[PDB]
Amino acid sequence: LAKTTADPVTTDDTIAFSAGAKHLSSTSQVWWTIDYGAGESSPRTALTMTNVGAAAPNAIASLSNQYTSGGTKLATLRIYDRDGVGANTGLLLASTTVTFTVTPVLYALESAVEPFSPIATVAAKWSFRIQRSKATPAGVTESIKC
């Protein structure tokens, strides 16, 4: 399990992984789940094992996720040998874990008052403007309630 993205990954872009599973000499059907921190995916898929031994591992591509908050995030790929379904489960055949840092997007604020000193009875107006640490991605409009 590897992370196919450069260093500066933040909470702005969707992160993509590459995955592969193989046995020394076997062909049986083995299944997988991926966990990003919230929990394991509930419906276990079914990986068809055909490449064996020195051959490159099979493809579990299309693994991707965008993280809500920055920090030291991780991702674990677990491989099972039985359906999850209702009751039965098999065994943890193997598990892989990767860790990476996600930079957060911070917001500053600019403020002003139109009279700068509200008179003891008249109305006053506050004006604010929110400034983003980095530019919004090309196609996303951020709407903030305040």
Side-chain angles (χ1 to χ4, degrees), residues 54-143:
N58 313 263
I60 318 106
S62 76
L63 295 179
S64 284
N65 179 25
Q66 204 222 13
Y67 293 104
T68 159
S69 153
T72 316
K73 321 285 257 157
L74 60 100
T76 74
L77 183 65
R78 258 169 290 259
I79 189 192
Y80 288 88
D81 57 327
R82 201 70 32 111
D83 40 346
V85 280
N88 77 76
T89 50
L91 292 167
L92 231 53
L93 260 46
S95 47
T96 300
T97 302
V98 289
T99 40
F100 47 97
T101 39
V102 172
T103 13
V105 174
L106 310 158
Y107 295 75
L109 184 88
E110 286 164 343
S111 31
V113 195
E114 265 314 323
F116 190 84
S117 276
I119 302 99
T121 207
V122 72
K125 206 198 67 187
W126 288 83
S127 184
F128 296 99
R129 192 211 273 152
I130 300 197
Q131 194 129 343
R132 199 171 142 115
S133 185
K134 66 184 304 297
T136 42
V140 175
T141 277
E142 220 92 60
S143 274

Side-chain angles (χ1 to χ4, degrees), residues 12-33:
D12 223 354
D13 40 352
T14 298
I15 305 173
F17 306 99
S18 71
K22 96 169 135 195
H23 189 278
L24 207 62
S25 303
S26 168
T27 286
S28 262
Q29 170 147 132
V30 84
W31 307 349
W32 67 267
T33 63

